[PDB]
Design an enzyme around this catalytic site. Structure first.
Site, PDB file in Angstrom:
ATOM      1  CE  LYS A 159      -3.918   0.440   1.973  1.00  0.00           C
ATOM      2  NZ  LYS A 159      -5.127   0.605   2.830  1.00  0.00           N
ATOM      3  CD  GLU A 185      -0.491   8.974   9.460  1.00  0.00           C
ATOM      4  OE1 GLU A 185      -0.939   7.854   9.782  1.00  0.00           O
ATOM      5  OE2 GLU A 185      -0.102   9.246   8.306  1.00  0.00           O
ATOM      6  NE  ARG A 186      -2.997   2.924  13.748  1.00  0.00           N
ATOM      7  CZ  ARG A 186      -3.625   2.655  12.612  1.00  0.00           C
ATOM      8  NH1 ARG A 186      -3.123   3.012  11.443  1.00  0.00           N
ATOM      9  NH2 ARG A 186      -4.787   2.013  12.651  1.00  0.00           N
TER      10      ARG A 186
HETATM   11  N1  ADP Z   1       7.259  -3.736  -6.120  1.00  0.00           N
HETATM   12  C1  ADP Z   1       7.878  -4.170  -5.000  1.00  0.00           C
HETATM   13  N2  ADP Z   1       9.142  -4.636  -5.030  1.00  0.00           N
HETATM   14  C2  ADP Z   1       9.767  -5.069  -3.921  1.00  0.00           C
HETATM   15  N3  ADP Z   1       9.188  -5.073  -2.705  1.00  0.00           N
HETATM   16  C3  ADP Z   1       7.922  -4.633  -2.529  1.00  0.00           C
HETATM   17  C4  ADP Z   1       7.182  -4.145  -3.698  1.00  0.00           C
HETATM   18  N4  ADP Z   1       5.970  -3.771  -3.261  1.00  0.00           N
HETATM   19  C5  ADP Z   1       5.931  -3.998  -1.925  1.00  0.00           C
HETATM   20  N5  ADP Z   1       7.095  -4.512  -1.489  1.00  0.00           N
HETATM   21  C6  ADP Z   1       7.383  -4.874  -0.080  1.00  0.00           C
HETATM   22  O1  ADP Z   1       6.155  -5.071   0.621  1.00  0.00           O
HETATM   23  C7  ADP Z   1       6.117  -4.330   1.841  1.00  0.00           C
HETATM   24  C8  ADP Z   1       4.807  -3.562   1.930  1.00  0.00           C
HETATM   25  O2  ADP Z   1       4.823  -2.723   3.081  1.00  0.00           O
HETATM   26  P1  ADP Z   1       4.343  -1.195   2.949  1.00  0.00           P
HETATM   27  O3  ADP Z   1       5.135  -0.595   1.816  1.00  0.00           O
HETATM   28  O4  ADP Z   1       4.351  -0.574   4.325  1.00  0.00           O
HETATM   29  O5  ADP Z   1       2.816  -1.340   2.475  1.00  0.00           O
HETATM   30  P2  ADP Z   1       1.700  -1.807   3.532  1.00  0.00           P
HETATM   31  O6  ADP Z   1       1.344  -0.535   4.262  1.00  0.00           O
HETATM   32  O7  ADP Z   1       0.595  -2.375   2.676  1.00  0.00           O
HETATM   33  O8  ADP Z   1       2.430  -2.818   4.382  1.00  0.00           O
HETATM   34  C9  ADP Z   1       7.310  -3.388   1.843  1.00  0.00           C
HETATM   35  O9  ADP Z   1       8.086  -3.559   3.032  1.00  0.00           O
HETATM   36  C10 ADP Z   1       8.112  -3.733   0.604  1.00  0.00           C
HETATM   37  O10 ADP Z   1       9.446  -4.121   0.939  1.00  0.00           O
END
Ligand code: ADP
Ligand code: ATP
Ligand code: ADP
Ligand code: MG
Ligand code: MG
Lengths: 464, 511, 48, 468, 49, 49
Positions: A159, A185-186
């Site tokens: 996300k 927001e947290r």
């Molecule tokens: N396109 C991508 N390539 C590599 N890693 C990804 C990709 N998309 C998401 N991730 C991994 O998935 C995790 C999603 O966490 P985050 O970015 O906080 O979204 P959410 O809030 O849905 O957890 C991240 O830590 C990231 O490392």
């Protein structure tokens, strides 16, 4: 001509003014808490004229330590936030105060957060598509330029990476800017987002406005309007296309309900404020395309008790144009962005808006994926052997399609060094038409991970 | 001891001073309305005769509405009320470790006075969005289910939510007990000081919790803030803030704090009682318009500070009691929204023998892997999918013949893992032991074991290693990862133990 | 074959039943919140 | 110095006093009703100070016939009740007046019914089983000597029958004193209990304090405090073990909520007073054992409309050591006592106290019953034939187990016409261990209905044509 | 009501009118809001009597 | 209450009485109407305390 505090009951403060000095509704007033431990300047927003020169106001900060009779200064205008290009790259609270650099932006132009939507004439009668460049979004759930997108997804589903991707695409493809509105927001998550945007080097393209969990309901109610005011300045004055993120819109609704309860208003059905629809409409109608420029909004929506008929989601969805659901299942497969092509939807995926070819290709992709999902349980339990030959062919085709909906995103470069791709809409339409027709089923599945258009598909096939 | 009172009397003295006074104009049900006191602040602490204390919550032109914090039956119309010129504040210091105090910081365990390092106001603002850093250090609860599926980091707020008699207090007490080894380490970067806030519990329940902490040696680093059921609504409303203030005094001095709120639903009820008695407008479930603000401002003070502020942290473990497992109720909804992750405990799982009764399907930790060590991250990677597939397949338990080999293997592995996550009460596991047990589960080393034996096997094997092959635990603890050589040695040890092990049914567990 | 068809039909029927029951439960939940608030505010107004 | 009645609205009376003569909160005031038919002396408890020298009071007797402006006298103290060994063997009301011998105890020492609970430093957790002889209670809800036991349930599920059974089983041979508080219950039940205690010869050792459901709200509020004051005296002064039976404690909360809006308080959720938890907490925290001083209290808690989520029982749950929860569903099956084994709980049901075998057998019984509860709907729709073999075996075992948890109680002989039975704890553990292993699967489930131990099981199986 | 009045002016002059209310659910919500802000006791689903 | 008093006269004179109330829910509704008309603060389902 200054008022004085007469009553204090939590965040609700009654202030008396002389006869000719009663502030207008929603004006911002300043009182002072001088007690050393809790010393601060208290911002009050006029909510009601009680008569007898008394106004009822909502404190934007905790009133702990406030005394009866202290002076209250009318500022002559409602809560005003700084605007301009200077707000980019900085974190502000709902009152316009810069949090990452206190005092910053105090000299900018200031705009009242209470503004009307564009006049009826100024609106665009024709709904337009926002070509993001992402294959899945463009094909299956096209975004409306100036419309609203609901975002659903748990933790660890990309996300935040999706939000960064959209910031990148609005900044680069459209030359636009982003405003993030953290409603409720947290603080930990706000700090995380600030640091991550700085690390992604997209903070310069974003203005962050945080109304945090541990503030009285007034700030959580007004933070969305503050961020929307910054976006409106970028659209109308700078002539940019803005992307406004709201997380969570339901918390804006709930803060409105809390404020309504604090003011003694009788709750409406299910305990929400009587003017729930009016408040949501006032917020959402300001997000639109006017005079060739648009604010597009992606909004995280919380659904109470998973009840989509609950008044809060029921009112919010009256304004939502598209829905994007992020799935744990898709993410676990390594498909990024982890969009759920079946649960997600768009209101403008109609032949009258996107054309007949796009509609046909998208419908065929949806049909194939739905059939594959139906066969998933059989595959899991009895294995793929029990499947028919036509079933096996469809399963292979659907696996390749579902993997070609993945894309190498701009925000994913910092994780996987490869740069992102921007597939034109026509290229995506033709590529998925070919995939559905069965013109790539011979190629290996791995060749469909995280690539752009057909050229990248050919190159990755050759590399295998 | 006559010398004790002699010292006070010889030291006692009073001096007249220009004082602002009000008079009680009415009193009822723990509230008192007092006229006068023109300069009284909001939340100012007032003193009524006989050493009775109140808090000025409701200020208007006529009178001040004050919540009486105890002995309300002594309040009488016409009594003189004095202002203190101070908002609510409590003493704080290292002297509060091992003590039981009321929400005013006054000892109630009968062990004498507490030497206060300083005083801290209950409403000091939480660390700002720029005074923090990312939660990146594990807070080991010692509970395999939590430490593997919903890991908790230092500075996180992990809600423990469930119906009555599901083990919420058990989980929190196990966490506090698990902090014992970290305490014995002596290093403040590893030590965790614990605050246990008891709101609305009967005094004997608090005594039982203190007894359990004594048994495990946890009271050496634990402070209890008790607002039992007999306390005034003021104490029940204030106790979480008192515990938070003590924890914050430690947190801002570079220490790491774990605070448990047992439970915030009773605090919400006390605050609702106060608000209704003060005639404030009620909303849903008759709660005031700022109950969400109550809990949110309480729980945003749990944070991981930046290195500029000493890098200390406070981890929150609020407890919420749901009714009929309705997590969409008002206060559960608010607290779920506030916190970083949730551990949902369920009576049906508890009665099934799944203890701790954590519903891993819905339990989440938004911090996630950032709060785990590398070894646990490796071994716990497959647990989520394994358990989800197991719950998908459990409808086919009796039809393993009809299932292909992959599905039957998945079902057996899921049963093994479900047994693996089971843990006895008052038995926290060190992180290295948890890593080894999860390794057993997820590496197919429990496949040859009967399901009903898994637990015993696990335990016995852990006792074997610690007795003869403690180098594995050393390696894991010091490096925080499972090396290739350590993994091979562990596999050989597991196989030899399997050779030595005997199932309940008697069949061999070898190969 | 007929057992497979009948169990598919029964599973779909259970799906429809669960959907309808969940809608009814959500309606009842909303109505309960509304009625509780009605009683609370009625008492509060009577006191005022 | 005397006050006068200003407003009369049901059980709540406003009284105006001269400046400086306003009575303290909870003081007992006296007013006279002189109308011949209803002539009496009202006792009013000062509930609030309204300002301007007016106090709002709750009447302990019906206010019919009361007149505005009549003199109101302040006793200068709270309601007080007689205390001492003399109260044993006698029946009192909330105001301390003896009902069987009017005028008795007037010369005894009197204690105020309002008291602070014991200091926290004086509280010691109690962990010691109180064997009753009831299979279900001893196996799944072991009672704690000196602890707090509650019997939850909706109307007409067997709370009072079980209270009488526990009186028979515990107080009949108790070496200390018994206090029975009838809080807002039927007068017929009070008379029956009085007669039963006199017949059993247990009355000599029991003090009865009755405030019936026909009393005004104030009496139902204060009767529990009166009985609790007698119990507190026996605990703190006489230094002997005390048995405290309360039926029904929910009536205290209900009476509190009956006057809440007449006292001017805005209602809380589900119509209860905003102060439900605080008043309940004070009262309950007075009902405790202190270090070296035992009060084994047993409370009947009524669950309104069978809704265990109702704020009253939900708030009460936190104050108990053991809770036997009676279920309407179990009742309607004819299973007695109608205990819900999956919903009841005991704080001492752990291996450390009750022992490995007891805990193991209890956990196995609970697991089997939970699985049966899960399978009930499937059996109802798709039938039992569609279950797996192990599930069919478990269903048979669970049905036999649920029947065997039923027992013929002595207090139930008036209903079933069948004499009661007493089962030693060891026999209960052995029998349920045999059940959970399937050692009785060949006996008809009807053989397990309303019997005692394994001897009764063998007899009934013989009567039904089976044999173990 | 404004639309209905405009239509009625034509209807009473012999014309034929077609009026569309899109939609009355939102009018009902608005009227409920107004009634609740007037503190009129609500009824079913918090709507005024 | 009238029926109860008439029966009580006989009861307190050695007679046996059977009294039927058809039905008490209507009496509760009437009492609720009286209490609300007297503006006594209502409770659950608007019934008096
Ligand atoms: N396109 C991508 N390539 C590599 N890693 C990804 C990709 N998309 C998401 N991730 C991994 O998935 C995790 C999603 O966490 P985050 O970015 O906080 O979204 P959410 O809030 O849905 O957890 C991240 O830590 C990231 O490392
Ligand atoms: N892991 C466990 N294994 C076995 N028994 C357990 C476990 N955890 C808790 N229990 C038991 O479950 C019962 C409930 O535990 P606990 O009181 O901690 O739960 P709770 O949800 O906080 O309860 P309450 O509503 O009474 O506050 C107690 O008997 C406790 O001993
Ligand atoms: N052990 C039992 N055996 C047979 N009948 C019983 C038993 N317990 C209760 N009952 C029936 O249920 C009724 C309700 O019991 P009682 O405890 O008086 O009501 P409550 O549970 O409301 O206090 C009894 O009058 C009796 O007829
Ligand atoms: Mg607990
Ligand atoms: Mg009864």
């Amino acid at each position: 001509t200054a008022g004085r505090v007469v009553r204090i009951t939590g965040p609700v403060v009654d202030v008396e003014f002389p006869r000719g000095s009663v502030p207008e509704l929603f004006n911002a007033l300043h009182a002072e808490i001088t007690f050393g431990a809790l010393a601060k300047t208290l911002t009050l927003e006029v909510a009601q004229h009680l008569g007898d020169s008394l106004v009822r106001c909502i404190s934007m900060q905790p009133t702990d330590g406030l005394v009866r009779g202290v002076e209250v200064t009318d500022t002559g205008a409602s809560i005003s936030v700084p605007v301009g290009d200077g707000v980019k790259g900085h974190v502000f609270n709902a009152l316009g105060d810069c949090l990452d650099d206190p005092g910053y932006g105090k000299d900018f132009e200031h705009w009242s957060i209470h503004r009307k939507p564009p006049a009826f004439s100024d609106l665009e009668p024709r709904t337009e598509m926002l070509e993001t460049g992402l294959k899945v979004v463009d094909l299956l759930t096209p975004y409306v330029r100036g419309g609203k997108i609901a975002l659903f997804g748990g933790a660890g589903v990309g996300k935040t990476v999706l939000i960064q991707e959209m910031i990148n695409r609005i900044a680069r493809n459209f030359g636009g800017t982003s405003v993030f509105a953290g409603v409720g927001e947290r603080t930990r998550e706000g700090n995380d987002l600030w640091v991550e945007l700085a690390d992604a080097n997209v903070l310069k393209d974003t203005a962050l406005v945080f109304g945090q969990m541990d503030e009285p309901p007034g700030t959580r109610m007004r933070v969305a309007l503050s961020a929307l005011t910054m976006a409106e300045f970028f659209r109308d004055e700078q002539g940019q296309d803005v992307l406004l993120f709201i997380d969570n819109i339901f918390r804006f609704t709930q803060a409105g309900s809390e404020v309504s309860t604090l003011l003694g208003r009788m709750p409406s059905a299910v305990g929400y404020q009587p003017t729930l629809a009016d408040e949501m409409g006032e917020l959402q109608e300001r997000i639109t395309s006017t005079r060739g420029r648009s604010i597009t909004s992606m909004q995280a929506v919380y659904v109470p008790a998973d009840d989509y008929t609950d008044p809060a989601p029921a009112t919010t969805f009256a304004h939502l144009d598209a829905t994007t659901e992020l799935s744990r299942a898709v993410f676990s497969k390594g498909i990024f962005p982890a969009v759920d092509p079946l649960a997600s939807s768009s209101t403008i995926l109609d032949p009258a808006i996107v054309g007949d070819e796009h509609y046909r290709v998208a419908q065929e992709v949806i049909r194939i994926l739905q059939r594959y999902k139906d066969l998933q349980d059989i595959i899991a339990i009895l294995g793929i052997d029990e499947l028919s030959e036509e079933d096996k062919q469809l399963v292979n085709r659907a696996r390749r399609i579902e993997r070609f909906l993945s894309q190498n995103m701009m925000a994913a470069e910092q994780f996987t060094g490869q740069p992102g791709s921007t597939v034109p809409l026509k290229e995506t339409i033709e590529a998925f038409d070919k995939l559905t027709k069965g013109e790539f089923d011979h190629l290996p599945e791995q060749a469909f991970f995280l690539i752009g258009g057909l050229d990248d598909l050919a190159k990755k096939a050759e590399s295998l | 001891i006559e010398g004790a009172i002699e010292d006070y009397v010889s030291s006692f003295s009073a001096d007249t001073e220009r004082e602002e006074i009000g008079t009680v104009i009415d009193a009822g049900d723990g509230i008192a309305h007092v006229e006068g006191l023109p300069s009284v602040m909001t939340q100012e602490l007032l003193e009524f005769p006989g050493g009775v204390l109140g808090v000025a919550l409701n200020l208007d032109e006529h009178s001040v509405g004050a919540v009486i914090l105890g002995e309300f039956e002594k309040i009488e119309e016409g009594q003189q009320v004095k202002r203190t010129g101070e908002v609510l504040s409590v003493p704080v210091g290292d002297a509060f470790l091992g003590r039981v105090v009321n929400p005013l910081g006054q000892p109630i365990d009968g062990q004498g006075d507490i030497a206060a390092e300083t005083r801290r106001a209950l409403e000091l603002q939480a660390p700002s969005v720029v005074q923090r850093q990312s939660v990146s250090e594990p807070l080991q609860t010692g509970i395999k289910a939590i430490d593997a599926m919903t890991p908790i980091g230092r500075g996180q707020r992990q809600l423990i939510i469930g119906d009555r008699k599901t083990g919420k207090t058990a989980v929190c007490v196990d966490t506090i007990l698990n902090q014992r080894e970290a305490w014995l380490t002596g290093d403040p970067k590893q030590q965790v000081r614990c605050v246990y806030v008891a709101i609305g519990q009967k005094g004997t329940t608090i005594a039982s919790v203190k007894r359990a902490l004594e048994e495990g040696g946890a009271m050496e680093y634990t402070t209890i803030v008790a607002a039992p059921a007999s306390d005034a609504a003021g104490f029940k409303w204030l106790a979480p803030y008192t515990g938070s203030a003590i924890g914050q005094h430690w947190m801002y001095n570079g220490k790491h704090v774990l605070i448990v709120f047992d439970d915030l639903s009773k605090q919400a009820d006390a605050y609702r009682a106060i608000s209704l008695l003060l005639r404030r407008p009620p909303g849903r479930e008759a709660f005031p318009g700022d109950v969400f603000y109550l809990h949110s401002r309480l729980l945003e003070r749990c944070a991981k500070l930046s290195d500029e502020l000493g890098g200390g942290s406070m981890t929150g473990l609020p407890i919420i009691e749901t009714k009929a497992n309705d997590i969409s109720a008002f206060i559960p909804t608010n607290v779920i929204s506030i916190t970083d992750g949730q551990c949902f405990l369920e009576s049906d799982l508890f009665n099934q023998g799944v203890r701790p009764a954590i519903n891993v399907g819905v339990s989440v930790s938004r911090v996630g892997g950032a709060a785990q060590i590398k070894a646990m991250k490796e071994v716990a990677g497959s647990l989520r999918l394994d358990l989800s597939q197991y719950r998908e397949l459990e409808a086919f338990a009796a039809f393993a013949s009809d299932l292909d080999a992959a599905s039957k293997a998945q079902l057996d592995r899921g049963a093994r893992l479900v047994e693996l996550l089971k843990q006895p009460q008052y038995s926290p596991l060190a992180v290295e032991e948890q890593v080894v047990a999860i390794f057993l589960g997820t590496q197919g080393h429990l496949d040859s074991v009967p399901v009903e034996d898994v637990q015993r096997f696990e335990s016995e094997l852990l006792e074997h290693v610690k007795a003869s092959h403690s180098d594995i635990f050393d390696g894991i603890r010091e490096t925080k990862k499972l090396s290739e050589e350590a993994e091979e040695k562990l596999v050989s040890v597991i196989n030899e133990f399997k050779k030595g092990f005997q199932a309940s049914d008697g069949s061999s567990v070898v190969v | 074959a007929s057992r497979r068809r009948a169990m598919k039909s029964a599973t779909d029927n259970a799906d429809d039943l669960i959907k309808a029951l969940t809608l009814a439960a959500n309606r009842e939940r909303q109505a309960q919140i509304t009625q509780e608030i009605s009683e609370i505010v009625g008492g509060a107004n009577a006191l005022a």
